[PDB]
Ligand binder design. Sequence first.
Ligand SMILES: N#Cc1ccc(CNCc2ccc(F)cc2)cc1
Ligand SMILES: [Zn+2]
Length: 140
Amino acid sequence: SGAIYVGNYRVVNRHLATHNDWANLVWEDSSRDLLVSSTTAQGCDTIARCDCQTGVYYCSSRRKHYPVSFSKPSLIFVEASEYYPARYQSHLMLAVGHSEPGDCGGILRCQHGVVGIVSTGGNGLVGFADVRDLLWLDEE
Ligand SMILES: N#Cc1ccc(CNCc2ccc(F)cc2)cc1
Ligand SMILES: [Zn+2]
C-alpha cells in the first residue's frame, strides 16, 4: 500500500483505490494502474520533472529502501499477479529488485522528487508506474 500526496491530490494504484477515492475522482487510467483523487489537506510530496533513470524505492515486504537503476517509462507486458491478469501496462519502468503485491504504492524517488509508485513485481523485477509526465499534479 501507499500513496503520493502532492498538493490536494492523492495518487494511488488504481487497483487499491477506495470507494472514497472513486467518489472524489480526478483522473484514472487502468492501463497505467493509476488513480488520482482530491484531498482536503495539502500533502508533503513533490513530483520529479526529469528523465532520471536512478533513484531509491521503498519495499514494504523488506522494510527497506533500495537504490535502483530503472528503464524509461514504456508499454510492457506484465505477467498475471494477484490483482491483475497478464496484460500490457503503459508508462511502466522496470528495475532489478524485490516486489510482492503488497509493495504496490511504495515511492520511487530521485534527486528531483517522486518519480512513481510500485505497481508490478515477480521474476526479480520491480515495476513502477511513472507520474513525471502528469504535469497537472503540480497545480490547481
Ligand atoms: N481482476 C482481476 C484479476 C486479478 C488476478 C488474476 C490472476 N489470478 C491468479 C493468479 C494469482 C497470482 C499469480 F501470481 C498469478 C495468477 C486475474 C484477474
Ligand atoms: Zn530526477
